[PDB]
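Following up on my earlier message about 2-acetamido-2-deoxy-beta-D-glucopyranose. Here are the inputs again, as you asked, copied directly from the submission form:
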Amino acid sequence: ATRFASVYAWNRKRISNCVADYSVLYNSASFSTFKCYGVSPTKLNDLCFTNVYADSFVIRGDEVRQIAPGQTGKIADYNYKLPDDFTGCVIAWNRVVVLSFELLHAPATVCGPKKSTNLVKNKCVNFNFNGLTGTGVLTESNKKFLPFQQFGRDIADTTDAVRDPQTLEILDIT
Amino acid sequence: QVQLVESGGGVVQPGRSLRLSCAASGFTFSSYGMHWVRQAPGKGLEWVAVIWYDGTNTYYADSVKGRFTISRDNSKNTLYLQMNSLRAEDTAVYYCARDLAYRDYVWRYFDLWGRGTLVTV
Amino acid sequence: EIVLTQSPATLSLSPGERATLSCRASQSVSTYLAWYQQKFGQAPRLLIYDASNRATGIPARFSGSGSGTDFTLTISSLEPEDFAVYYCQCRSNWPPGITFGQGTRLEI
Amino acid sequence: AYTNSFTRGVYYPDKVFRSSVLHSTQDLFLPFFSNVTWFHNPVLPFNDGVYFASTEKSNIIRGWIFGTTLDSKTQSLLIVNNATNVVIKVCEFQFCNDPFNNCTFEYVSKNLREFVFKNYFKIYSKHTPINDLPQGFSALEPLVDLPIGINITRFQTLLAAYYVGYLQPRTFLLKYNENGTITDAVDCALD
Ligand SMILES: *[C@@H]1O[C@H](CO)[C@@H](O)[C@H](O)[C@H]1NC(C)=O
Ligand SMILES: *[C@@H]1O[C@H](CO)[C@@H](O)[C@H](O)[C@H]1NC(C)=O
Ligand SMILES: *[C@@H]1O[C@H](CO)[C@@H](O)[C@H](O)[C@H]1NC(C)=O
Ligand SMILES: *[C@@H]1O[C@H](CO)[C@@H](O)[C@H](O)[C@H]1NC(C)=O
Ligand SMILES: *[C@@H]1O[C@H](CO)[C@@H](O)[C@H](O)[C@H]1NC(C)=O
Ligand SMILES: *[C@@H]1O[C@H](CO)[C@@H](O)[C@H](O)[C@H]1NC(C)=O
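Thanks, got it. Here's what our run produced:
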């Protein structure tokens, strides 16, 4: 989206209730700088944060470093956004989005893209169906879960069946 | 003495496997990203693999997708590269290279080249 | 995908004269597309990025022009410090790899 | 006024299918046969959670306000069902003296309507025909789940007969039939 300006009233939004796909933001040709301070970018997209903060502003070719340590000088301490202990990325392209990552009391919403392998039945496997975890053979079931129930539990609290989260079919786990 | 020296040039039949290594020295191995670019005889440079400075994510060119393995062990400050299912085109001068940018994930330029090790099949 | 198309196949000239290579990009490549100078056996070194921006270590004699699908390099006065082979290079988004050209040889 | 709640207010405690089995669970439930305050507007405490039920013909009741101060000064949850759809938003709204700023999200997704509002913020509900608060059993099912982290202590209904009861940390034995529908329940502290 076009037009951008101002750093001191630099505009800022919570990013929340969405899956934060940072994957696309490497692969485009046009980014010239992408960094992280503290943790790797593919290592970012498997954490799970309450509030992803983003903000943007237009700049001149020669750019002063956006502040990792509390960087030192002129506009880089007299106009903005000076996070000494910044566990926060810095993007740029041919114009920057400086990212602060909140981990506050709230239930973490803006969470990794959760990349998903492809179902294999009738053999043995370690499975992770939506955070439910454990080894077994998944086979086609005849059980009829109600629309909102995600996993069947046996009499003695052992998981007996699951709903596959992408095709909403019920698999027994023997 | 900021140089890389390659290692592991040799000959193998098609369908078998090979492993190369590149030694880095004079600079911080675990602070820069690394590439392997291969120069087939009489032809131009063709990127093979890259790694960001902490080896936490890796990309391969299409011609080698799912057939070669790039890895860094900072214990010895040694870069590796395994091979599987090598074919006739794979003959080349494998130049391990070092990335241009300090701690930037763009992975865009090659600022430093190894002398290149022959591999033939 | 981006395929760089390089002309002429070769250049033959005396040193001191004006050397012009052309690289016709397939489709606009935004603000960075590179030129590589490789002497025989040596390690290739960038000369120009952005197609007019003078990279560091580069004497002023090397000049480039273009945007979109016209990209051309000029050298005003050749000396043996420059007499090598030359490539035009870029990176990609559709899937994440890199395209060089085929190369353009220079002759005396 | 007060009404006898009978055995209403039971809901699926979790998202696990269980079948032909009696499962004992402890949760914030409406106690069986407690009496539920009956309103024919005012702000009520929210306490541990609220069971809300209404009987409507013309769908006068539309929504809820939840929070602590219920003016601007803190985040407050506003839930309004209007026309075809539901607007849930948590801005620091400056509320009206009798209704009828900084956001953190905006979620859009004869007639006896039962809801359970409990605190992230969970809404369960059930919609059944009937023709004062019916004696019978049916179970409410989770429909909406809000990751807000808001402190809720007080709430108000946005508009005519509705009932408000309060949930208590009680143990229930829930009976699931073979399709995994809860068909009965025993209130372990009733008698
Ligand atoms: C996810 O995508 C698949 C397409 O392969 C689609 O069939 C499926 O329904 C989608 N997920 C859900 C929960 O519908
Ligand atoms: C209803 O609750 C009130 C609490 O004030 C109590 O006085 C009254 O006896 C209760 N009625 C029944 C039928 O339990
Ligand atoms: C429901 O309410 C929202 C805002 O409160 C409004 O924009 C929307 O149009 C309403 N639904 C319909 C179907 O009009
Ligand atoms: C908006 O509300 C949240 C609630 O926790 C608060 O943390 C945040 O500081 C508020 N916005 C601003 C700009 O302070
Ligand atoms: C919400 O209540 C808790 C105690 O239950 C308290 O610690 C917290 O400070 C309250 N929220 C705010 C924003 O003060
Ligand atoms: C359970 O579900 C099946 C099909 O979903 C239905 O035929 C049956 O009547 C339902 N009730 C019982 C008690 O089985």
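One observation from looking it over: Residues D 75, 102 surround 2-acetamido-2-deoxy-beta-D-glucopyranose (ligand 4) (CB under 6 Å). Hope that helps, and feel free to reply on this thread.
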